[model samples]
Target: MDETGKELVLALYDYQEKSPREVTMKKGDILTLLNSTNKDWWKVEVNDRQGFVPAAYVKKLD
Candidate 1:
């Protein structure tokens, strides 16, 4: 990602969270990247909802 609101498309399935930050994703869902400083968990937003996902599950198009 290049900016705070950088968008990314998922490259795989990523599901393991609850509300407020529920990031259950599929292989093609687009998401906004909020934070990627954490190697294991990256904060993202999709459909006005925010959540954490595994860094490896996304395909960064930056």
Candidate 2:
């Protein structure tokens, strides 16, 4: 399954990518959520870049 429409999230904490599959993020950064099937990790896009980030690090925007 895939996502349609825009789902944005705001970073609540800084996260450094530990693996190649993950993406680094800074606190206060806004990202577009791509996938959220995994409860622990969520795929997001920022500056046209895409990767996974810890779900707990971000807050979903309405």
Candidate 3:
């Protein structure tokens, strides 16, 4: 992603804890775009799991 964001690469696998390995994303994924919040963070979603991602790693869209 650039300074803004990656249109193709959106959303993340939100885990139950603070571990990337705990990611429970679906195999055949759909529209999982982790949109950024005012707090400068992005809320990711898994199959039934979800969490917030750091804006540092995520780039907001234009």
Candidate 4:
């Protein structure tokens, strides 16, 4: 999906219109693609914090 094949920064699904599942994260954390076959789901950790964030939540700013 990206050069590193991983995206950084974004909001996770909260099952609500504004609410989110995973909130806040740190640096150096590792994000693993959960159920990678979906091609729409991603699990990431911001350095210390970790959670699942949808690919749709993020996009290439370029």
Which candidate tops lDDT? 2
Summarize candidate 3's per-residue lDDT along 1-62 as a digit string, tens digits: 33324432333443234485434333223334555446575565556667654434333342
Model 3 spans with C-alpha error above 4 angstroms: 1-31, 60-62
Local lDDT at 39 for model 1: 63
lDDT (CA) for every model shown?
0.64, 0.72, 0.43, 0.43
Model 1 over residues 1-62: C-alpha lDDT tens digits? 53422455455674665665455776665677766676677776677666667678766763
TM-score each candidate. Answer: 0.56, 0.65, 0.36, 0.34
Candidate 2 deviant stretches above 4 angstroms: 1-6
Cα TM-score of candidate 1: 0.56
lDDT of 2 at 7: 74
lDDT of 3: 0.43
Ranking by lDDT: 2, 1, 3, 4
Q: Best candidate, TM-score-wise?
A: 2
Q: In candidate 4, which residue pairs clash?
A: 26-46, 27-47, 29-47, 31-44
Task: State in Å the error of residue 1, model 2.
Answer: 20
Give the Å error, residue 12, model 1. Answer: 1.6
Q: What is model 4's C-alpha RMSD?
A: 7.0
Cα lDDT, model 3, residue 16: 35
> Tens digit of lDDT per residue, candidate 2, span 1-62?
12222476767899887887777888977677766787686777777787767788677753
